[PDB]
Nucleic acid binder design. Structure first.
Length: 222
RNA sequence: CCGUCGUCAGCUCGUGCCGUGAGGUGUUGGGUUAAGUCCCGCAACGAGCGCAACCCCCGCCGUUAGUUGCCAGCGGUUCG
């Protein structure tokens, strides 16, 4: 799929906190705010989306990451739609470098889910009960989407690259491709497949991700 | 084998990350606790030794048990 000239939604976000390297993606300043040149965002989308089709039909896995408060309720949604994994609540340092050590945390969920169905529930100390009840509680937060990761992902779809420069760092080191919805404040020089655009705006995050996923699905043929 | 700091709440490790390196991070900060007790947060996620917990006494109650116990209810007293 392709997009329209939907310009009533992305056309810049941040004030004057920008990163000089982003210049290549700005139109001009208006009322002290940078405005992204959309004619250019179209040139980038037409490539990034290419990458995803490639990935998708090749049957790949894209980890969706966005710890921003605004994208919270969106990230959850979209990933769930492919079969994609995602990082909603908070991004754990090493969910990719130290994966084998974290995937261990995953098994801890697996093993607890089990106990809370089996007969060994109320039967045994209750102090531990609470103690164990809380552990799932926390897991069913952070790991909620990571769970789907059988092995490290073929690409990451990050939202605020500068906020998730930890995730990006990691990936960058493990040679996993980076796809992010970036703008004024990011270092484009580190994002394999950029998507220059506003993002605090639900209206922006929502569009950028939906059109991506629709790409994802139509790619596999559903 | 014991005294002692000290029943104090600490002491550390794997892997990850930071640093040429000694080392650091985790264990920290904000809240909380009797406690590194727990919450929130954070390049960390866990784990070990320690805290706690499992064990004994005390306080309520139940079941099993009646040569301690009692007119608690009845019959006699040298009415103990």
């Amino acid at each position: 799929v392709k997009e329209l000239l939907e310009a009533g939604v992305h056309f810049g976000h941040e004030r004057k906190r920008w990163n000089p390297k982003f210049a290549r993606y700005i139109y001009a300043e208006r009322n002290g705010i940078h405005i992204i040149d959309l004619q250019k965002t179209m040139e980038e989308l037409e490539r990034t989306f290419r990458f995803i089709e490639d990935l998708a039909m090749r049957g790949g896995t894209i980890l969706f990451v966005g710890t921003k408060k605004q994208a919270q309720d969106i990230v959850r949604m979209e990933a769930e739609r492919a079969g994609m994994p995602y990082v909603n609540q908070r991004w754990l340092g090493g969910m990719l470098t130290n994966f084998k050590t974290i995937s261990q945390r995953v098994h801890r969920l697996e093993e607890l889910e089990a106990l809370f169905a089996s007969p060994e529930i109320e039967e045994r100390p209750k102090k531990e009960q609470v103690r164990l009840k809380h552990e799932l509680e926390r897991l069913q937060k952070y790991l909620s989407g990571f769970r789907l990761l059988k092995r490290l992902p073929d690409a990451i779809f990050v939202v605020d690259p500068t906020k998730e420069a930890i995730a990006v760092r990691e990936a960058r080191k493990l040679f996993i491709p980076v796809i992010a919805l970036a703008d004024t404040d990011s270092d484009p020089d580190l994002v394999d497949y950029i998507i220059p655009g506003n993002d605090d705006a639900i209206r922006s995050i929502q569009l950028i991700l939906s059109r991506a996923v629709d790409l994802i699905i139509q790619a596999r043929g559903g």
